[PDB]
Symmetry: C3
């Protein structure tokens, strides 16, 4: 039988994942989303230009709804008692590497359009796998998105990249009937993200991916 | 540019008691799918003359029934480790949203109460709950808890049992398929008292009823 | 009104209390799930319920899973109590979850990679039927490198299972469905989200979908 000891990166996640579920009791909701109009919005932007990914695109909406449900992007402090809510909506997106997991953070989302968000993610990925991500480039996420939905899955119950308060679960696009669906999932600090507040968000995010001719306004 | 926001009356009460919730009770939570077709037209008819009732208050009536079949799930955790205390009355925690936070109220002795007596209650217990007029009377010895979010959204959640009880039951949005109307159900519980198996055997033995309410007359 | 009743604790009950308390105490849990075209499997079972009793879903599954624990070695491990340790295991000894009157028991198909479909399915009843009668021996309940829990012999679409501590991964079997015009079923995974990352976890079950997905090829 072969062993090892906890190495560099694998060390960071060991201690941050223990912390994560050590401290924050998790609650998770899932919602079906008609990503049909979605798809053809991506299959149109792939032709007439370049880029956008399912991931990137979902990162363009996510802030604007964090804006609306304020409690969803805070972090939890040293101090039991307090919270620091956040008003600079910028996201992290977890990538697989060789050495381990990662979460580069694309700064103030709600100001880089969709194309950009999605080249940002690649520059930060194709480097993530080289692990040449300057330590600047991994801080200050108000909130995080995780997509297995490239590698597979249909539904996940993620662990909240601490010390954020929420994270979002992206997945494989599945073909039931004749319209393309994808389940999303949200896990969040149920010390503060209550019954409704939880859902009420995912349902709203749902509500947009499910009518993007709107996003325009 | 940030915002402090500590906590208040309730927030702080929920904080500690969610901390305390999922700190001791390890969580198995399972989901079955229910052909709630035959339940919906039950209700949708009672609108056309019977005044009520509600998806919840309906589940609430059957729920106790099925508890008496598997005692372990209507059981409260305790003080010292080493102690179990299952109860044999039935008061069901059913928890609405407020602007203040998550409130939870218990329909005392639901096993004696009527589909309507239940539902015509949850209403006057929750119109209050948001406008914050709810007596201590209305909030103590719960035996188990049900939590409808599908009046809002979602297909399935991973809800967290209300302490110190031992199981909980999530309800979520109702969707068409064939189109018969299904919706997913979920119940989470303590994996010390409720071995995985027997919880499943609870929701199916619930699932079954929701799919044969004719046969609720037993 | 009302009247409660204080119900104490026991050998096996209290050992479940423990394994469980201490399961989620330190295994911070992740869950993921895919859906399988179990339609091409399920029918295989059906040709062989006719001529060669028996073979199950649990049987079928048990005998594929290790060959997929081979590809990703990271989930076939114990979790160590000099804290920071590995014990990535390299032999496969698959666990099983089963309801016995007294409480949840587990047992192990010693060396799964060496046993054919039937033999394991023989062994499972020859142990469940004996855990039920509470006559199951100390060397049979040990050494599990990984465990499967089936509930869809009673129900469930999908559940978040709890690892048999101190293993490191668990796979959760469910009922089949009949979507249209196909027979699907949800599988589930739960693993220590440290010694097992984000992707990997799914990347795993997906390759396990893959070889339920086309059994026709699993002659070799």
């Amino acid at each position: 039988e072969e062993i090892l000891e906890m190495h560099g990166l694998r060390r960071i996640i060991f201690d941050k994942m223990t912390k994560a579920k050590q401290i924050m009791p998790h609650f998770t909701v899932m919602e079906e989303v008609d990503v049909t109009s979605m798809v053809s919005i991506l299959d149109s932007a792939k032709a007439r230009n370049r880029k956008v990914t399912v991931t990137g695109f979902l990162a363009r909406i996510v802030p604007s709804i964090l804006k609306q449900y304020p409690y969803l992007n805070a972090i939890y402090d040293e101090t039991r008692r307090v919270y620091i809510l956040k008003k600079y909506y910028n996201i992290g997106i977890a990538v697989d590497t060789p050495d381990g997991l990662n979460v580069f953070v694309i700064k103030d989302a709600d100001r880089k359009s969709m194309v950009e968000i999605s080249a940002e993610i690649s520059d930060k990925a194709s480097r993530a796998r080289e692990n040449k991500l300057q330590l600047d480039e991994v801080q200050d996420s108000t909130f995080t998105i995780t997509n297995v939905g490239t590698i597979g899955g249909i539904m996940s119950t993620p662990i909240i990249n601490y010390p954020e308060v929420a994270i979002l679960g992206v997945h494989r696009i599945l073909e039931r009937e004749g319209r393309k669906y994808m389940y999303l999932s949200l896990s969040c600090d149920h010390r503060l993200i209550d019954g409704a507040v939880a859902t009420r968000f995912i349902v709203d995010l749902k509500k947009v991916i499910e009518d993007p001719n709107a996003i325009i306004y």
